Amino acid sequence: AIATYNAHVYAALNLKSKVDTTFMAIGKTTAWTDETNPPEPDPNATGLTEVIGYKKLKTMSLCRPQRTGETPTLPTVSYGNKTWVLVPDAQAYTEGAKWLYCEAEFVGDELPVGTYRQVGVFTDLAPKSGVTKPNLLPSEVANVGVLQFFENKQFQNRTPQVTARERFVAEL
Amino acid sequence: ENLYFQGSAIATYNAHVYAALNLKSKVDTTFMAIGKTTAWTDETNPPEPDPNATGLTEVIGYKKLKTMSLCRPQRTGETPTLPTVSYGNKTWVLVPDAQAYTEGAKWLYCEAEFVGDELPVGTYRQVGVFTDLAPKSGVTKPNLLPSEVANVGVLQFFENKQFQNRTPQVTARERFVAEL
Numbered sequence: 001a002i003a004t005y006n007a008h009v010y011a012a013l014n015l016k017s018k019v020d021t022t023f024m025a026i027g028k029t030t031a032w033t034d035e036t037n038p039p040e041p042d043p044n045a046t047g048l049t050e051v052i053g054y055k056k057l058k059t060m061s062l063c064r065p066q067r068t069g070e071t072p073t074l075p076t077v078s079y080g081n082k083t084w085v086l087v088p089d090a091q092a093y094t095e096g097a098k099w100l101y102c103e104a105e106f107v108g109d110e111l112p113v114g115t116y117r118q119v120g121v122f123t124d125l126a127p128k129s130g131v132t133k134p135n136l137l138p139s140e141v142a143n144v145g146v147l148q149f150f151e152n153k154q155f156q157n158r159t160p161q162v163t164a165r166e167r168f169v170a171e172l
Numbered sequence: 173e174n175l176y177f178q179g180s181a182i183a184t185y186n187a188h189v190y191a192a193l194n195l196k197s198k199v200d201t202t203f204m205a206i207g208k209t210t211a212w213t214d215e216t217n218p219p220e221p222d223p224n225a226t227g228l229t230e231v232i233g234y235k236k237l238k239t240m241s242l243c244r245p246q247r248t249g250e251t252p253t254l255p256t257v258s259y260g261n262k263t264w265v266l267v268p269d270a271q272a273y274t275e276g277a278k279w280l281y282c283e284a285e286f287v288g289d290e291l292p293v294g295t296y297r298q299v300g301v302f303t304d305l306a307p308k309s310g311v312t313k314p315n316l317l318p319s320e321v322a323n324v325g326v327l328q329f330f331e332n333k334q335f336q337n338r339t340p341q342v343t344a345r346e347r348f349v350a351e352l
């Protein structure tokens with residue numbers, strides 16, 4: 001079962017290759033049992049609970065945590081308190097980038113407005129023939145693809161005047 | 173008004189199955205290698221495999237897989253319909269690609285036959301699987317000497333075990349199950 005470090009990088013590179021068909025979803029319109037303490041995400045999930053809609057990623061890149069004494073030349077994303085170094089595909093193995101960075105914005109009413117508690121990334125999403133737009137209602141997706149990673153968090157309310165920028169880093 | 177969030181998302185069970193399916197898709201360029209001609213410090217207790225390894229120590233040769241299939245451990249009360257194999261101390265149920273997610277097959281089964289002198293004879297202590305192996309030019313043969321490989325590809329998983337001896341009269345059937 002002993003996989004190499006490079007096996008994880010290979011898996012991350014494989015996800016990045018699916019960029020043209022990678023979408024970030026928002027869901028869970030209904031309240032958690034405890035709104036202040038969301039339950040831990042169960043890996044057996046094949047999709048989001050009460051999926052609202054799908055949004056094509058603004059950015060998808062391989063990455064790795066910054067070293068303590070490193071002054072990075074490459075771009076950095078500063079997720080609250082911890083810095084990540086974005087690595088181009090060619091330096092994947094040399095940099096040991098076994099993590100994947102994903103970013104997407106939910107601008108106003110492009111998807112139905114309301115509360116949401118879930119964020120997840122799907123690869124190989126089939127938009128119904130005749131649709132190119134990055135914002136897809138669940139009735140507009142032909143086959144949701146494969147839910148790769150998701151997160152359960154405290155509710156956020158979205159209005160036609162609100163732009164929600166959702167970004168996350170997943171280890172592979 | 174604008175909202176900003178940065179979080180720690182966990183991989184799904186299906187993400188592991190997807191990774192295993194991705195390796196199976198590389199079947200045409202997947203090779204099993206054998207190595208470590210020299211004895212371990214303690215021949216009876218081999219050292220734990222270091223994941224930072226990019227290849228095998230004293231690589232002997234590369235042999236294209238006889239079988240590569242997705243699999244999962246057999247359940248305690250299961251009487252499997254599908255084919256079964258033995259690795260570690262357990263039994264594994266071989267699952268076809270179509271039933272990958274339904275069966276939750278996040279493990280990969282690989283098998284290769286090392287028939288006699290097709291690769292240099294002697295003792296070996298390592299077994300590893302490589303994907304995207306480039307044979308020098310347009311060569312087709314399944315048995316490749318390290319001097320015959322143009323680019324070894326990506327060492328996906330390997331094992332350190334007690335020695336096995338191969339002679340021109342011996343056929344070694346190496347099987348291993350790796351979790352993804």
Ligand SMILES: [Cl-]
Nearest residue numbers: 038152153154
């Ligand atoms: Cl939270």
